[PDB]
């Protein structure tokens, strides 16, 4: 269930509400400023890191479950979504239908959105690929 959730359901949740559009009306008293703006932020592919921890000073290192139990940390991994930004402009002629065009401000760009706690021995976990001697090295019971 956890591998299904990480591999497929996270991307589905991202894609269900990926597009976020805010239409800024012209609000023009005079016809000099008859331009309307439409700003679109869209989420793309979601990426999951290996489990990790950031300390107080900002140094981030790979976290293994033995260390997370001893230091009372959370065995989690970061989520990074691709965000593309769209800016659209249209000449606000009353009666005429608005036709938006890109101003070529299509800046895009992984952005950190949170830390998903990782189930142990799942595909994202370090212990899934570990052999018995590797588990003994990490002070994990096989």
């Amino acid at each position: 269930s956890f591998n299904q959730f990480v591999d497929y359901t996270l991307q589905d949740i991202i894609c269900e509400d990926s597009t976020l559009i805010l239409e800024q009306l012209a609000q023009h008293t005079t016809e000099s400023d008859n331009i309307s703006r439409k700003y679109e932020i869209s989420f793309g592919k979601i990426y999951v890191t290996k489990p990790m921890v950031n300390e107080s000073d900002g140094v981030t290192h790979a976290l293994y479950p033995q260390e997370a139990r001893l230091r009372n940390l959370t065995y989690s991994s970061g989520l990074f979504v691709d965000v593309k930004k769209r800016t659209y402009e249209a000449i606000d002629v009353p009666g005429r239908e608005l036709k938006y065009e890109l101003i070529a401000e299509e800046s895009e760009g992984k952005v950190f959105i949170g830390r998903l706690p990782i189930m142990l021995r799942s595909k994202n976990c370090y212990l899934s690929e570990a052999t018995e001697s590797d588990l003994y090295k990490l002070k994990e019971c096989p």
């Binding site: 559009i21 805010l22 239409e23 800024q24 009306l25």
Partner: peptide, 9 residues
Amino acid sequence: LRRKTRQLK
């Protein structure tokens, strides 16, 4: 007086 910004579904 017109709303400056609005949500677009």
